[PDB]
Design brief:
homodimer, binds ligand NFJ, aspartic-type endopeptidase activity (chains A, B), Cathepsin D, subunit A, domain 1, mainly beta, seven-stranded mixed beta sheet, host endosome (chains A, B), 9 strands, Retropepsin-like_cat_dom (chains A, B)
Chain lengths: ~100, ~100
C-alpha cells in the first residue's frame, strides 16, 4: 500500500507469535523492538540516537510479518519507547520512499 | 524520485544559503539539524529520542530545499547525532512510503 506521512507511519506487525504496532522508519538502519522475552541466543549492544544510548539485546534471523509481507533479519530488543522497523527489514518487504 | 532503502536515504539540503547532507527519517515527527548558525529568531524547546530528551533551538518558518523541492517549516537545531528531515517537512515535498 501507500502510506502518507501526515501521521506516524504505524503498522501492525507479527513477531514471535505476537501482534504489535511499529514504525516504518527510514532513519533506522536496523530494527528495534520493545522489551520482550524472545527465545534463542542474543548478544548485548548499545544503540544511540537523540538523547543518548540504550542497551539492547541483538537477535539474528527473527521472522517478522509486516502488513502481510514476511521478513527475516536482525532485531534489537530493549527499552525503546516505540517499535521501529528499520531498513534491514523495510527492504525485504519492498518498501521505498517516493516523492 | 523513488528511493530504495538498501542504503541510508541521505540527501543534499539547502538551508540558510548553505548546503548540507541530511537523512530522510520517516520515524521523526520533527526536523532536527546539528549545531549551526541560522538567521532569525528562535525559542528554546525540548525533544525526545530513543535515548532521552535534549534541548534544541526551534526556528519557525524556515525555508529549506530538499533535493530540489522547497519547504517552509519548523527546523530544530541541537545535539542530534545526524541531520534528519522529519515528517513535518517530508509531507511538504510529497513524501510517501510504498510497498
Ligand atoms: C536521530 C536518530 C536517528 C538517526 C541516528 C535514528 N533513530 C530513528 C529515528 O527515526 C527515531 C525513531 C524514534 C521515534 C519516536 C521515539 C524515539 C525514537 N526518530 C527520532 O528520533 O525523531 C525525533 C525528532 O522528531 C521527533 O519525533 C520522534 C522523536 C523525535 S533512533 O530511534 O534513535 C535508532 C538508533 C540506532 C538504531 C540501530 C539499531 O540501527 C535504530 C534506530
Amino acid at each position: 500500500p501507500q502510506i502518507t506521512l501526515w501521521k506516524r507511519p504505524l503498522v501492525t506487525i507479527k513477531i514471535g507469535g505476537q501482534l504489535k504496532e511499529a514504525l516504518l522508519d527510514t532513519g533506522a538502519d536496523d530494527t528495534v523492538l520493545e522489551e520482550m522475552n524472545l527465545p534463542g541466543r542474543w548478544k548485548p549492544k548499545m544503540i544511540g540516537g537523540i538523547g543518548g544510548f540504550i542497551k539492547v539485546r541483538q537477535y539474528d534471523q527473527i521472522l517478522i510479518e509486516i502488513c502481510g509481507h514476511k521478513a527475516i533479519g536482525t532485531v534489537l530488543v530493549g527499552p525503546t519507547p516505540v517499535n521501529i522497523i528499520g531498513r534491514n527489514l523495510l527492504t525485504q518487504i519492498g518498501c521505498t520512499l517516493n516523492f
